[PDB]
Ligand binder design. Structure first.
Ligand SMILES: COc1cccc(CNC[C@@H](O)[C@H](Cc2ccccc2)NC(=O)c2cc(C(=O)N[C@H](C)c3ccccc3)cc(N(C)S(C)(=O)=O)c2)c1
Lengths: 383, 9
């Protein structure tokens, strides 16, 4: 639509709190309109193409004169949910993105399990990571590769995800918009092009170092993934962080079910005691030798509001740091703090403080550096 | 009033 300038893309994301950020897209001729989840954690573009009780609409191939069948089926399992369907290609646009149309690979989802989310209001997923993790294999070009190859759009995008039961945010395809952040952009390298893999080199909780061998933080990888809710941490790191949070906030008496995300903590509306809870800092590898920077999130990011489970008299929350056995996942808990620039052209990810992050009058999310890391240990997990 | 309290999910 129209000029595709950055001002037209600001605020092009919507969602329900806790159910994913999506952008509007059109597929097929004539255009069929669907809300598509923005997922930096995977690389397949896939839309519902069959009735499903959670879907209010879906893509109908037979209606599109520009659809082509690739006669190959496909199966994707994620950490949460799975789906299968048929590969094909079709014309695709983004009404509040660039002003372009691209022929892209589409998976028509015909069966799924625990994938679609009731009331989330989206009907597909946009995998924005690289080919290497696309199913069935890396020869299925992801959408972002197609868009850059076929158009003039610069090889970057950036995301501003805004926390809380409606959320919003922006995907700027092709550049950086100055009104979505304040302060400076700090960049960490993309270690390998598959997931948007990065290296964490130090973790602090309330300024106190977790004091683990830095390889533990990236065992067996660390990714930035807009399709995952939580900050997911490898088991050993999960355990230490909970301990450290529990101590800093004297919540040793909270049930351990709260800490495994099996129960909500509820306070009188307007009284959440933000300040008993510690800020969390990740130091990320810098762009020069032995330099790093940190990102810092508040409890306002790692405690997430949950609605319609209890009286409006009360705010209730879920602990949204959880355990993983497949590496760190810097999910929405992390991304809601910052403006995040996915600078594929220069193999780097940028963080700046988000103009829209939830904070209080005492504390804000921060992005700070440079720090000289006296340690020349290689923090990446290798074997 | 009793706070905080906990709810299952
Ligand atoms: C094939 O690519 C793979 C395979 C395995 C793992 C990965 C790593 N990235 C995972 C993401 O791609 C996928 C994409 C996705 C799945 C299901 C619905 C919607 C999106 N996300 C998840 O697997 C995934 C999605 C969620 C989740 O609820 N996401 C919803 C949509 C969301 C809510 C709020 C903000 C962002 C997202 C939670 C978790 N957790 C395990 S948690 C409870 O620890 O947060 C995992 C990639």
């Amino acid at each position: 639509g129209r000029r595709g300038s950055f001002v037209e893309m600001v605020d092009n994301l919507r969602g329900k709190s806790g159910q994913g950020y999506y952008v509007e897209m059109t597929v097929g001729s004539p255009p069929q309109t669907l809300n598509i989840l923005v997922d930096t954690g995977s690389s397949n573009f896939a839309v519902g193409a069959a009735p499903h009780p959670f879907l209010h609409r879906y893509y109908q191939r037979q209606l599109s004169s520009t659809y082509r069948d690739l006669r190959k089926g496909v199966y994707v399992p994620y950490t949460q949910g799975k789906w299968e369907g048929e590969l094909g290609t079709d014309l695709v646009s983004i009404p509040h993105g660039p002003n372009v149309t691209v022929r892209a690979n589409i998976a028509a989802i015909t069966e799924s399990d625990k994938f679609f989310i009731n009331g989330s209001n989206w009907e597909g997923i946009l995998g924005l990571a690289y080919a290497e993790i696309a199913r069935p294999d890396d020869s299925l070009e992801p959408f972002f590769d197609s868009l850059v190859k076929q158009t003039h759009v610069p090889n970057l995008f950036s995301l501003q995800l805004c926390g809380a039961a409606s959320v919003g945010g922006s995907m700027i395809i092709g550049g950086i918009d100055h009104s979505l952040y304040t302060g400076s952009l700090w960049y960490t390298p993309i270690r390998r092009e598959w997931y948007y893999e990065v290296i964490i080199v130090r973790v602090e909780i309330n300024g106190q170092d977790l004091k683990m061998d830095c390889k533990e933080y990236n065992y067996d990888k660390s990714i930035v993934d807009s399709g995952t809710t939580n900050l997911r941490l490898p088991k050993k790191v999960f355990e230490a962080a909970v301990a450290s949070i529990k101590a800093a906030s004297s919540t040793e008496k909270f049930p351990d079910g709260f800490w495994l995300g099996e129960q909500l903590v509820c306070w009188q509306a307007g009284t959440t005691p933000w300040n008993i809870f510690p800020v969390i800092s990740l130091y990320l590898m810098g762009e020069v030798t032995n330099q790093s920077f940190r990102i810092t999130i508040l409890p306002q990011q790692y405690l997430r509001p949950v609605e319609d489970v209890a009286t409006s008299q009360d705010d209730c929350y879920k602990f949204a740091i959880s355990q993983s056995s497949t590496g760190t996942v810097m999910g929405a808990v992390i991304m809601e703090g910052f403006y995040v620039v996915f600078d594929r052209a220069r193999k780097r990810i940028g963080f700046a403080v988000s103009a829209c992050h939830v904070h209080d009058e005492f504390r804000t999310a921060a992005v700070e550096g440079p720090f000289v890391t006296l340690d020349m240990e290689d923090c990446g997990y290798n074997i | 009033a009793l706070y905080p309290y906990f709810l299952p999910i």
